[PDB]
Design a protein around this ligand. Structure first.
Ligand code: SF4
Length: 83
């Protein structure tokens, strides 16, 4: 059960960025974002995930203010966690 503030499917930014809470049901391969092979990309290893926001598998994403993403999700703004 997703948190009340989870990013959902008719969120306009989620649609534009092709977010899915489950990276295995994402188009990460098509996008081929740089930094890691696409099959290795998900929110946990993304620069925009906020480790101090949320709880458990439901964490912040800087791009979705006031909401939570799933650590096992993906979107097209995936960028390697570099610092
Ligand atoms: S920007 Fe990164 S952390 Fe935020 S939803 Fe997209 S992949 Fe997940």
């Amino acid at each position: 059960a997703a948190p009340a503030n989870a990013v959902t499917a008719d969120d306009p930014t989620a649609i534009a960025l092709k977010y899915n809470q489950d990276a295995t049901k994402s188009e990460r391969v098509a996008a081929a974002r740089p930094g890691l092979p696409p099959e290795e990309q998900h929110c946990a290893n993304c620069q925009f995930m906020q480790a101090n926001v949320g709880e458990g598998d439901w964490k912040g994403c800087q791009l979705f203010p006031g909401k939570l993403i799933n650590v096992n999700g993906w979107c097209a703004s995936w960028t390697l966690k570099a610092g």
